[PDB]
Design an enzyme around this catalytic site. Sequence first.
Site, PDB file in Angstrom:
ATOM      1  N   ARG A 172       0.817  -1.208   0.000  1.00  0.00           N
ATOM      2  CA  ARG A 172       0.000   0.000   0.000  1.00  0.00           C
ATOM      3  C   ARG A 172       0.853   1.261   0.000  1.00  0.00           C
ATOM      4  O   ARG A 172       0.568   2.205  -0.745  1.00  0.00           O
ATOM      5  CB  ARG A 172      -0.938  -0.008   1.202  1.00  0.00           C
ATOM      6  CG  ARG A 172      -1.738  -1.286   1.352  1.00  0.00           C
ATOM      7  CD  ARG A 172      -2.782  -1.147   2.445  1.00  0.00           C
ATOM      8  NE  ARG A 172      -3.268  -2.440   2.912  1.00  0.00           N
ATOM      9  CZ  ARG A 172      -4.153  -2.589   3.890  1.00  0.00           C
ATOM     10  NH1 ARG A 172      -4.647  -1.526   4.504  1.00  0.00           N
ATOM     11  NH2 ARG A 172      -4.545  -3.801   4.255  1.00  0.00           N
TER      12      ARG A 172
HETATM   13  N1  LIG Z   1     -11.495   1.100  -4.525  1.00  0.00           N
HETATM   14  C1  LIG Z   1     -10.222   0.318  -4.659  1.00  0.00           C
HETATM   15  N2  LIG Z   1      -9.526   0.358  -5.795  1.00  0.00           N
HETATM   16  C2  LIG Z   1      -8.382  -0.343  -5.931  1.00  0.00           C
HETATM   17  N3  LIG Z   1      -7.902  -1.085  -4.975  1.00  0.00           N
HETATM   18  C3  LIG Z   1      -8.539  -1.174  -3.812  1.00  0.00           C
HETATM   19  C4  LIG Z   1      -9.774  -0.435  -3.631  1.00  0.00           C
HETATM   20  N4  LIG Z   1     -10.188  -0.719  -2.368  1.00  0.00           N
HETATM   21  C5  LIG Z   1      -9.289  -1.556  -1.826  1.00  0.00           C
HETATM   22  N5  LIG Z   1      -8.376  -1.777  -2.701  1.00  0.00           N
HETATM   23  C6  LIG Z   1      -7.246  -2.635  -2.447  1.00  0.00           C
HETATM   24  O1  LIG Z   1      -7.499  -3.444  -1.213  1.00  0.00           O
HETATM   25  C7  LIG Z   1      -6.435  -2.957  -0.240  1.00  0.00           C
HETATM   26  C8  LIG Z   1      -7.020  -2.779   1.098  1.00  0.00           C
HETATM   27  O2  LIG Z   1      -7.461  -1.438   1.250  1.00  0.00           O
HETATM   28  P1  LIG Z   1      -8.050  -0.991   2.753  1.00  0.00           P
HETATM   29  O3  LIG Z   1      -9.314  -0.115   2.563  1.00  0.00           O
HETATM   30  O4  LIG Z   1      -6.975  -0.190   3.514  1.00  0.00           O
HETATM   31  O5  LIG Z   1      -8.414  -2.382   3.577  1.00  0.00           O
HETATM   32  P2  LIG Z   1      -9.361  -2.478   4.910  1.00  0.00           P
HETATM   33  O6  LIG Z   1     -10.681  -3.157   4.530  1.00  0.00           O
HETATM   34  O7  LIG Z   1      -8.669  -3.283   5.960  1.00  0.00           O
HETATM   35  O8  LIG Z   1      -9.634  -1.101   5.432  1.00  0.00           O
HETATM   36  C9  LIG Z   1      -5.943  -1.684  -0.755  1.00  0.00           C
HETATM   37  O9  LIG Z   1      -4.541  -1.501  -0.390  1.00  0.00           O
HETATM   38  C10 LIG Z   1      -6.066  -1.793  -2.197  1.00  0.00           C
HETATM   39  O10 LIG Z   1      -4.884  -2.466  -2.714  1.00  0.00           O
END
Ligand SMILES: Nc1ncnc2c1ncn2[C@@H]1O[C@H](COP(=O)(O)OP(=O)(O)O)[C@@H](O)[C@H]1O
Lengths: 35, 466, 456, 53, 477
Positions: free
Chosen positions: E350
Amino acid sequence: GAGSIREAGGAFGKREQAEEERYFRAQSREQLAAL
Amino acid sequence: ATGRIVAVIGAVVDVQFDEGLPPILNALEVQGRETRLVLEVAQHLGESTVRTIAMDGTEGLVRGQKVLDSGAPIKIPVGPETLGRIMNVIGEPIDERGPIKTKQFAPIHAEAPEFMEMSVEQEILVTGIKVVDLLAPYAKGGKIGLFGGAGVGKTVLIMELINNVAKAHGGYSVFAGVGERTREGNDLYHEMIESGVINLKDATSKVALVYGQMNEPPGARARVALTGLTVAEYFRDQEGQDVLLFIDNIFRFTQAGSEVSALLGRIPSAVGYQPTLATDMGTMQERITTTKKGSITSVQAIYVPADDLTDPAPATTFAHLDATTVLSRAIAELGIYPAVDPLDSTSRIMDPNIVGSEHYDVARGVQKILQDYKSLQDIIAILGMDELSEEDKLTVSRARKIQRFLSQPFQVAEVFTGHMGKLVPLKETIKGFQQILAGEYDHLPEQAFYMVGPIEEAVAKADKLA
Amino acid sequence: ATGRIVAVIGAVVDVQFDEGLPPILNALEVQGRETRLVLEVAQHLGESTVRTIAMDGTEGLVRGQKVLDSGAPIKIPVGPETLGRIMNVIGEPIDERGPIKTKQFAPIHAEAPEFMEMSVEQEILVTGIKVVDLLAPYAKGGKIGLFGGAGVGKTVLIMELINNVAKAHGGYSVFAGVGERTREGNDLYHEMIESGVINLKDATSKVALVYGQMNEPPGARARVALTGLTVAEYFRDQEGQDVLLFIDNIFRFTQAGSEVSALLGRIPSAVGYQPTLATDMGTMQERITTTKKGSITSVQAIYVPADDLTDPAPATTFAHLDATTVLSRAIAELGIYPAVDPLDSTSRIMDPNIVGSEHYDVARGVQKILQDYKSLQDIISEEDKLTVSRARKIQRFLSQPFQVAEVFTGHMGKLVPLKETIKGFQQILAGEYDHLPEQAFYMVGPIEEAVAKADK
Amino acid sequence: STTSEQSARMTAMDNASKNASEMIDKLTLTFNRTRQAVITKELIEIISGAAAL
Amino acid sequence: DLEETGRVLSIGDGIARVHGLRNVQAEEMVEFSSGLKGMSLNLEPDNVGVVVFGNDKLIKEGDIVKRTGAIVDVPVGEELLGRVVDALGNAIDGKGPIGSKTRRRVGLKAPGIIPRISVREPMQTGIKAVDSLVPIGRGQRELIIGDRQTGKTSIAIDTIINQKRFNDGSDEKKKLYCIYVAIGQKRSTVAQLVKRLTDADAMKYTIVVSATASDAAPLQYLAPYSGCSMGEYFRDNGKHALIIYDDLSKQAVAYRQMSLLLRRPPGREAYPGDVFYLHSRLLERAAKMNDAFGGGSLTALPVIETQAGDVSAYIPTNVISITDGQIFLETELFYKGIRPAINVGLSVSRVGSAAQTRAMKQVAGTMKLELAQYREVADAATQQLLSRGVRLTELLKQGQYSPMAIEEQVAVIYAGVRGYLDKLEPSKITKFENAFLSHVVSQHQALLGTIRADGKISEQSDAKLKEIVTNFLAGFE
Ligand SMILES: Nc1ncnc2c1ncn2[C@@H]1O[C@H](COP(=O)(O)OP(=O)(O)O)[C@@H](O)[C@H]1O
Ligand SMILES: Nc1ncnc2c1ncn2[C@@H]1O[C@H](COP(=O)(O)OP(=O)(O)OP(=O)(O)O)[C@@H](O)[C@H]1O
Ligand SMILES: [Mg+2]
Ligand SMILES: [Mg+2]
């Protein structure tokens, strides 16, 4: 697991039931008209 | 009232008072500590002994150490001076910008609004996200809940909602980080500074920030959501403002309770959870509400343990929300982002009298065709695509096109995909899904709907592919 | 010091000492019994009482019965005089051949070798068995999971390993029958006597048997593995040998630990196993290693509950296994002996940095040709027939006659060196024997025997 | 047309059996996970009921 | 003297009930008469619960417990570099005592929000797949998650070995000090790992903290925090440390043992409720500090072992919710010969993408796009995508214990993504690669040097690369 596919329900068991009913309503039609 | 510590077990401290036993929920200051160690009274054990939960680490505590009763619960500064500032669970500034000079302090423990203070208005909150706007639209003053397992996109979605709704917002906004990554808090702080939303030079800031993150002991993680609630409640009741309240993650609140429920001497419930799970969650969530004195729109990210959606914590949170966005790992692994499950996300304004019959019918048709595809999945998976009828093949084609069209590039997700983020209006969403449903694009390849904005970009991508 | 029994609950006995409590894991002798009853201390309960697990039945015990502290853990006789005998968890002879007359005793509870005593390089333990040495070799000092149960010649393989290690490397063997059925224990004793591994007349026995039966309390079945491991540890540290240690079954070791932990009133972990599952397995398995004096290599019969490799007991055992030997019935039906499945047996040292580039290349070529043969069997061109022929020859050549079977089949026993194995399979792969018939590689030693048999 | 349907059918049933075996492997993994979880849940219920005495 | 001294009331289940110690603090190191040590976990009105850092066999009821007056801490400093210590900071390699004049509490809290700044500097692993597709920056927490025997420890060891090129140079802001924490591994495995690092001359900047499978569960529980304090010593003094936890699944198992022996309510899979906090309070201490706090960092590589590839289990999802991305090692790719068996479609970084060097970005954007298209495809354009994807996949394989400099990775990925390998049959790519690298190492040191100095592929350097690749591919098989 002899009736496993239709005891589990789902697409493969609901299609089996439909096929059975189709065939035998056909046969019951062609059996009643011959009476 | 001065007592003395008689027991220390993890985050739970038994304190013994000779004169003046303090009521439940009071704050007690431990004497002889470098930083402020606050204990919240949870139980009276008899024999003039109380049990308490510590707001910080309890290392270095000794049996016999003195403890003073403040006389009131944990009190945090509330006011316009909290905007652009970062405070921890007990209201101390953790941004090194000096003290928070408010005029009033509020206890983080208060009763929920009465039944006669409730509001019933249900205006729609357009976010610019196609799947949310179409299938489970949010409401102004409502309660939004984003469910999802580990790494499915809860934070990306909540930051996209901050980018879309909170930036152009009229009123104030509060972000409470509850048991999440500290570097994510640093990212959010510096991003809100570099975007001008937090202004370190004057009183033009529009966002308050509360943070108890996953390094904090369970007591701080249990009360920091209440601190954020208190700031938002001040901005709602005492200023009539329209508040945005972003919580991430609210599940951690529940989780922290578990960690102390063992030490408080309570018989565990199912999945080892506190027996008071639903009542604690309700006591917290009923303060997160709209009244007729002011509105609060609440976006809460809800962690789903081991992707189990029937876990006591998310299953209990489901009943507190006006709109729920359920992210899926299966949908995310297909490359569809956001990973919203279209057959699991709901809203209470998805009613033709609220969204219009056209919007309602388009959303219902999309969900129906997706459900039909889901029904066909088994026969498709074993016997392959060739054994379907022509109508089944047509509905599968349209359903896969609709699936890909539900995906969308986010403005906050450019940095790890390079693709510019699209913000699709509501009419464009209804129109595009209406046209995919009517059969106006049965000739385009299904990969032309993937990661686009409106339907015109889908046509352009289909052209560029050819 | 002398204490007295204050509580008897099943196989758990609380003993109170008015003075000088015995440390945890000590052995206590209950006094006034027709047969020896040993209690292993497990907890200090406070008020001069200790909780102990019994190594035998506790019927007829009386509160207030005297109990004698021995001042050490369970001590067993170690030495060459244990070879060819059968002893139980407390070092008593159970073969009715008199006392085991050794000069030294050893406690069954000892610590794993220190970090500075470990051999910093992995090396191969040559067994003289072609399929094992080639496709899934045994690391000297490693753990080998032996899969496959009845009807695949597991006992013949065990006896052949004992004999081959005694002949080639000059090291003895121990056999710990954890949870051993008494019927199969008797059968194995007599199979070893017949095949010459055990010798009841002279001092040329090659294996020491340690049996803990199924009708023994969970503590005995939990510590019998440590008893066998202590015999092997003597043979390694004091004689400087390359000992073999067989543990059958290891799942029964885990189950005995689980039962002992449940009797001591500990909260069960996942799937009902002991909360100390990993540390039990660790404090046992970390003693089977290569020191600067010798080594202990352990072949451990694996049982997988419900055929689920993610079960806590197999998944905890697999963290320690350095090799895997799968005896398959499909290979035995093909007349191939040993019935070692050549595609399912794995080894962690099958790596060009450990076994050499040539050995690794030969093994990978053999594996690829066998995979190709089965893929061709799926459907049944120009060279597909050539691969079929060469893979038939490879299959036949993996078989080998064992010495411990000479009195049954009449043939001689082949102990193939490692270089001869590599060379033979190299030559078969490079097409040096496409003129010999495929039945000329069946039950021979080196490849010279294959050409001499094709001469007929 | 025969020798075209008797080979296309052979290939189709081969692919059907392959997909069925893949789904069987996935479902077996899920089944093992679920039965381990059920045993553990029953154990925890019994232990929690016994610790309340 | 029942104020600085106690007597053991009871011992068993790894926990010692001690009477006395009326002045002991919570989480304070006490010392038993048998030389063992313990942590005062539960202070109660009549007794102290002490977690023993060793075998219960050494403690009898009535034994005398003195208190050290110090909350549990470990020695820290540069005197630990090159030493193999246990979970308490005692040397186990037989080279004498650690000459540390500084100690640090193992239970300190992570830096808050203000002391940090976003990760910007690259942490070079030396592995093509990682450095190109899953870049890691200094201050990140990257999870290495996979089944048993899929190559996780090999990735960690390759990173540690790769840091040798920087630790020998003269640029102090580029050096990385490595800490390897072994938790529940075989002791022979750790000895072989220490020798492997000594052969590569990588021990002189490595600390190995070892709590193996035969060590008490409290020691395996404590080892990660000891290693983390040893790394925080560098993070807080302007230097940069990397730390590997191999692995956290075994630490979770040890903590579950300690919790069940204390009769605490089991949760999912009988794990305690605070098994998330266990790892969160630990991995939050890996941070990047801003220049007001020194500018040092601490990079964490927690390892997690899954069962049958299930990454939706309890502990895997906990650590995924804690860290900044993961590297999925697949068993299907390991058995097929693809090594490192990185699942490039599921492995994500990330916060590391903003730390990649410019040249690696220049080639890796195209590489990621093309591998993605290859994944989605599997005419004449789709077969070209298949060819390019197969070539790139073969280009991503790598040997063991031989990490590459970033410029050489750039050159190889360049030759791959620009299309020069599209006529080579795939079974030769690997061969070509080695050959090509050898050439660029001997005849073209200046182009590698200028790509390293610039950090980017200049158009002059791009032309030099094009010339060299065409001229070498010409005289190739
Ligand atoms: N809208 C998106 N577009 C592209 N990749 C995404 C998107 N949402 C999540 N991801 C991918 O899934 C990973 C997890 O994102 P995150 O929101 O931080 O997880 P969590 O559900 O634990 O909060 C991201 O680093 C990204 O690689
Ligand atoms: N890039 C590689 N190339 C060739 N072989 C490799 C590579 N990586 C790993 N291996 C091999 O796989 C073997 C086991 O992998 P490794 O021990 O490094 O990973 P692991 O997941 O930590 O295993 P464990 O289950 O013991 O923890 C290594 O001994 C090595 O021989
Ligand atoms: Mg998040
Ligand atoms: Mg490893």
